[PDB]
Design an enzyme around this catalytic site. Structure first.
Site, PDB file in Angstrom:
ATOM      1  N   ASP A 168       0.828  -1.219   0.000  1.00 51.40           N
ATOM      2  CA  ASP A 168       0.000   0.000   0.000  1.00 51.40           C
ATOM      3  C   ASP A 168       0.858   1.264   0.000  1.00 51.40           C
ATOM      4  OD1 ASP A 168      -1.858   1.929   0.368  1.00 51.40           O
ATOM      5  OD2 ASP A 168      -2.751   1.023   2.179  1.00 51.40           O
ATOM      6  N   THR A 169       1.050   1.844  -1.210  1.00 50.59           N
ATOM      7  CA  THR A 169       1.857   3.033  -1.336  1.00 50.59           C
ATOM      8  C   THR A 169       1.210   4.236  -0.676  1.00 50.59           C
ATOM      9  OG1 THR A 169       0.900   3.548  -3.516  1.00 50.59           O
ATOM     10  CG2 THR A 169       2.896   2.227  -3.487  1.00 50.59           C
ATOM     11  N   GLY A 170      -0.101   4.194  -0.420  1.00 47.83           N
ATOM     12  CA  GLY A 170      -0.794   5.296   0.258  1.00 47.83           C
ATOM     13  C   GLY A 170      -0.695   5.239   1.766  1.00 47.83           C
TER      14      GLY A 170
HETATM   15  C1  LIG Z   1      -6.694   1.207   4.285  1.00 51.18           C
HETATM   16  C2  LIG Z   1      -6.685   0.732   2.820  1.00 51.18           C
HETATM   17  C3  LIG Z   1      -7.031  -0.763   2.705  1.00 51.18           C
HETATM   18  C4  LIG Z   1      -7.679   1.553   1.995  1.00 51.18           C
HETATM   19  N1  LIG Z   1      -7.342   2.958   1.912  1.00 51.18           N
HETATM   20  C5  LIG Z   1      -6.237   3.400   1.094  1.00 51.18           C
HETATM   21  C6  LIG Z   1      -5.019   3.661   1.958  1.00 51.18           C
HETATM   22  O1  LIG Z   1      -3.872   3.658   1.127  1.00 51.18           O
HETATM   23  C7  LIG Z   1      -5.170   4.904   2.832  1.00 51.18           C
HETATM   24  C8  LIG Z   1      -5.107   6.195   2.011  1.00 51.18           C
HETATM   25  C9  LIG Z   1      -5.116   7.358   3.010  1.00 51.18           C
HETATM   26  C10 LIG Z   1      -6.348   7.703   3.565  1.00 51.18           C
HETATM   27  C11 LIG Z   1      -6.399   8.718   4.493  1.00 51.18           C
HETATM   28  F1  LIG Z   1      -7.635   9.082   4.999  1.00 51.18           F
HETATM   29  C12 LIG Z   1      -5.255   9.384   4.937  1.00 51.18           C
HETATM   30  C13 LIG Z   1      -4.040   9.065   4.343  1.00 51.18           C
HETATM   31  F2  LIG Z   1      -2.919   9.750   4.752  1.00 51.18           F
HETATM   32  C14 LIG Z   1      -3.965   8.085   3.355  1.00 51.18           C
HETATM   33  N2  LIG Z   1      -4.076   4.840   3.808  1.00 51.18           N
HETATM   34  C15 LIG Z   1      -4.206   4.973   5.132  1.00 51.18           C
HETATM   35  O2  LIG Z   1      -5.267   4.827   5.773  1.00 51.18           O
HETATM   36  O3  LIG Z   1      -3.044   5.189   5.781  1.00 51.18           O
HETATM   37  C16 LIG Z   1      -3.035   5.776   7.098  1.00 51.18           C
HETATM   38  C17 LIG Z   1      -2.253   7.063   6.911  1.00 51.18           C
HETATM   39  C18 LIG Z   1      -1.436   7.514   8.083  1.00 51.18           C
HETATM   40  C19 LIG Z   1      -1.971   6.958   9.397  1.00 51.18           C
HETATM   41  C20 LIG Z   1      -1.552   5.521   9.194  1.00 51.18           C
HETATM   42  C21 LIG Z   1      -0.145   5.701   8.675  1.00 51.18           C
HETATM   43  O4  LIG Z   1      -0.033   4.755   7.631  1.00 51.18           O
HETATM   44  C22 LIG Z   1      -1.231   4.021   7.391  1.00 51.18           C
HETATM   45  C23 LIG Z   1      -2.327   4.840   8.066  1.00 51.18           C
HETATM   46  O5  LIG Z   1      -0.113   6.963   8.030  1.00 51.18           O
HETATM   47  S1  LIG Z   1      -8.632   3.977   1.949  1.00 51.18           S
HETATM   48  O6  LIG Z   1      -8.119   5.334   1.861  1.00 51.18           O
HETATM   49  O7  LIG Z   1      -9.358   3.612   3.182  1.00 51.18           O
HETATM   50  C24 LIG Z   1      -9.661   3.635   0.585  1.00 51.18           C
HETATM   51  C25 LIG Z   1      -9.425   4.245  -0.648  1.00 51.18           C
HETATM   52  C26 LIG Z   1     -10.249   3.901  -1.721  1.00 51.18           C
HETATM   53  C27 LIG Z   1     -11.177   2.914  -1.589  1.00 51.18           C
HETATM   54  N3  LIG Z   1     -11.933   2.460  -2.606  1.00 51.18           N
HETATM   55  C28 LIG Z   1     -12.819   1.551  -2.247  1.00 51.18           C
HETATM   56  N4  LIG Z   1     -13.707   1.006  -3.040  1.00 51.18           N
HETATM   57  C29 LIG Z   1     -14.771   0.110  -2.601  1.00 51.18           C
HETATM   58  C30 LIG Z   1     -15.012  -1.090  -3.509  1.00 51.18           C
HETATM   59  C31 LIG Z   1     -14.262  -1.270  -2.207  1.00 51.18           C
HETATM   60  S2  LIG Z   1     -12.672   1.216  -0.546  1.00 51.18           S
HETATM   61  C32 LIG Z   1     -11.361   2.345  -0.381  1.00 51.18           C
HETATM   62  C33 LIG Z   1     -10.676   2.687   0.722  1.00 51.18           C
END
Ligand SMILES: CC(C)CN(C[C@@H](O)[C@H](Cc1cc(F)cc(F)c1)NC(=O)O[C@@H]1C[C@H]2C[C@@H]3[C@@H](OC[C@@H]31)O2)S(=O)(=O)c1ccc2nc(NC3CC3)sc2c1
Ligand SMILES: [Cl-]
Ligand SMILES: [Cl-]
Ligand SMILES: [Cl-]
Ligand code: NA
Lengths: 99, 99
Positions: B25-27
């Site tokens: 997960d690059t995000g």
């Molecule tokens: C958690 C993973 C499985 C999913 N995410 C993408 C993820 O890369 C997320 C992107 C992202 C969201 C955010 F709201 C704030 C960010 F900075 C980055 N990273 C994250 O939570 O890292 C957090 C960031 C901060 C706090 C910790 C630490 O690393 C991981 C975690 O740094 S997500 O943002 O929740 C996301 C994005 C599109 C998406 N598309 C979907 N589609 C539906 C069919 C299923 S669900 C879904 C969920």
């Protein structure tokens, strides 16, 4: 390009004539952008991430440039904490992960 | 390897003597794993994503094998709905995004 991951993989996108910053996110199925105006109709979608779910507006077939590459596809608009380019558009710009 | 993004980039990891499936997960800045025990000291942390924040335990200096490649770093443990390998460990296996 080849982008290493020592810093966040942030790029410039252009959507609706406006430049914004967004995160290339292989962990996102879909592309989610902060509140903005887009043309046409939208459909509802609920998406789940680390802290629970958010409701977003799904707009289809939106023109969007990502790091200078043109894509046309679905953009979800809602109260996301960061603009995220997910796999639906990473595939349109030909992105892969490599190690 | 070269991992395309048509589907979720899931790989097998070994952590704490256990095999698990996790998302490259690059995000994600940090690596976040579902509730499990790990040895040593930890401290609490709050991390925010889509939906809001969760409380996790931060363990430092944890060895993890990711798709066959060994790496050490901090691992966050808590109620994430998906195991995610974030940039702190992706860098160590030499992962890059290419397009
Ligand atoms: C958690 C993973 C499985 C999913 N995410 C993408 C993820 O890369 C997320 C992107 C992202 C969201 C955010 F709201 C704030 C960010 F900075 C980055 N990273 C994250 O939570 O890292 C957090 C960031 C901060 C706090 C910790 C630490 O690393 C991981 C975690 O740094 S997500 O943002 O929740 C996301 C994005 C599109 C998406 N598309 C979907 N589609 C539906 C069919 C299923 S669900 C879904 C969920
Ligand atoms: Cl799409
Ligand atoms: Cl680390
Ligand atoms: Cl490097
Ligand atoms: Na430790």
């Amino acid at each position: 390009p080849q982008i290493t991951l020592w810093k966040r993989p942030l790029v410039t996108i252009k959507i609706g004539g406006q430049l914004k910053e967004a995160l290339l996110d292989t962990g996102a199925d879909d592309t989610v952008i902060e509140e903005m105006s887009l043309p046409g109709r939208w459909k509802p979608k609920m998406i789940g991430g680390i802290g629970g779910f958010i409701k977003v507006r799904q707009y289809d077939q939106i023109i969007i440039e990502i790091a200078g590459h043109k894509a046309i596809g679905t953009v979800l608009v809602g109260p996301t904490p960061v603009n995220i380019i997910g796999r639906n558009l990473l595939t349109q710009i030909g992105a892969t992960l490599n190690f």
